[PDB]
């Protein structure tokens, strides 16, 4: 009974699978040219240092699982097949921990490296996923104290690794303020200012055209030299009612502000999401309980919620009301139906811990944990401890 609670819990101890995910996050406000020189520097490392395992790397930029923007990129790393890389160091768990330690040399990006779980339709990352379901009832962007707890104050990792954001930090933006009084007092109407600023920078889409027998689109935008700087805001002209051109900086100024490039709504409140894995050596249940000493530091209103592939750990958990409490409950009935007694079906279920006493020992000695394969293994050993009992108690009860 003590050794049952001494073992930790998990769910599907995952496999190599030859695949590896790696996302980058340059600091906010970075261009795509700054992201590309990190993505290519990550790409060249895996093809000469880790050529024993890595077969081919496919890097996209502008998009990862955390979000989208010019400050985001990711890599699908497909490894060698199972017979071309022998040795336990060529596993993805020993490639990931030695590539993640190398990625701390890259200074201008929070580069990560992780594996998906054993199931692929469920989850895209091994380890826990917890959402900061922050039910404080506050206004929609006065909830920045949830972010303040989300940065490092929920990242006090005693035995975790690669605890990472899944949103992204807020960045500077350029608020373009146009006064309609002065602009209208020079004759130029405001709808033309709206159409000019929406076509020149916003890449309007006018209608469709056809080439090679396929219908495609025709877009309309200013040239790249005219939309790079705030001073390039002052290069565009609008025609007033008298028919002459007013510059754009005669009635419009600019001012820097600070805003988030990604906004969510999770179960009625905008949450922030945290991904992370357990350290090499321990299971997933003690990691999901080792974040419970981190969640006890929390402000008002917020809470933690397990979801995704971590929803089953806290909705299934241990099925002590149902699993191996109503399974072997009915075998006492179905053996009373065949033994025609009260005490001799009790005797053959009395010997049931003598099978699980080594079923716990084998997973304790190999270092595994309590997962669903361990549960269905125990559900065989109940029947195994029963079939040795019944085969030698049937002859004991017929001969009497």
């Amino acid at each position: 009974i003590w050794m049952f609670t001494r073992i930790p819990t998990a769910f599907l101890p995952d496999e190599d699978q030859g695949v590896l995910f790696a996302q980058v996050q340059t600091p906010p406000g970075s261009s795509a040219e700054r992201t590309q020189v990190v993505v290519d520097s990550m790409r060249e490392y895996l093809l000469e240092k880790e050529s024993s395992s890595v077969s081919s790397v496919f890097t996209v930029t502008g998009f990862n699982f955390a979000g989208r923007g010019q400050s985001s990129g990711m890599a699908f790393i497909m490894l060698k097949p199972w017979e071309e890389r022998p040795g336990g160091e060529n596993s993805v768990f020993e490639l990931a921990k030695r590539a993640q330690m190398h990625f701390f040399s890259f200074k201008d990006a929070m580069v990560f490296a992780f594996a998906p779980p054993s199931v692929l339709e469920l989850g895209n990352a091994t380890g826990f996923d917890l959402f900061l379901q922050d039910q404080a009832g506050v206004g929609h962007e006065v909830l920045l104290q949830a972010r303040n707890k989300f940065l490092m104050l929920a990242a006090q990792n005693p035995a975790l690794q690669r605890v990472r954001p899944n949103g992204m930090s807020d960045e500077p933006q350029y608020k373009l303020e146009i006064d309609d009084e002065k602009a209208s007092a020079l004759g130029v109407s405001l709808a033309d200012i709206n159409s000019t600023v929406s076509i020149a920078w916003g890449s309007s889409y006018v209608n469709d055209f056809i080439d090679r027998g396929r219908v495609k689109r025709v877009y309309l935008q200013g040239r790249p030299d005219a939309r790079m700087n705030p001073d390039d805001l002052s290069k565009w002209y609008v025609r007033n009612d008298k028919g002459e051109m007013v510059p754009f900086n005669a009635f419009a100024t600019g001012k820097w502000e600070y805003g988030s490039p990604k906004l969510e709504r999770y179960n009625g409140v905008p949450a922030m999401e945290i991904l992370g894995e357990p350290a090499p050596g321990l299971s997933s249940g003690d990691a999901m309980a080792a974040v419970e000493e981190i969640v006890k530091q929390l402000p008002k209103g917020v809470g933690y919620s397990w979801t995704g592939l971590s929803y089953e750990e806290r909705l299934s958990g241990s099925q002590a009301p149902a699993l191996y409490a109503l399974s072997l409950l009915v075998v006492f009935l179905c053996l009373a139906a065949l033994y025609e007694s009260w005490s001799i079906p009790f005797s053959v279920m009395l010997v049931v811990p003598l099978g699980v006493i080594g079923a716990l020992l084998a997973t304790s000695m190999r270092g595994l944990s309590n997962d669903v394969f361990f549960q269905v293994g125990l559900l065989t050993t109940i029947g195994l401890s029963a079939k040795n009992a019944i085969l030698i108690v049937e002859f004991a009860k017929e001969l009497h």
Binding site: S343, I344, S347, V348, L350, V351, L354, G355, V356, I357, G358, A359, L361, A362, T363, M365, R366, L368, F373, F374, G377, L378, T380, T381, L384, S385, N388, A389, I392, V393, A396, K397
Partner: peptide, 28 residues
């Protein structure tokens, strides 16, 4: 491993205790 280690102790123990528990004296 959970079924190998579960079966070996279900064999080398229960052959001593299932005859010990059929002869439980409450079955008068």
């Amino acid at each position: 491993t959970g079924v190998i280690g579960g079966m070996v102790t279900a064999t080398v123990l229960a052959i001593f205790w299932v005859p010990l528990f059929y002869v439980a004296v409450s079955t008068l």
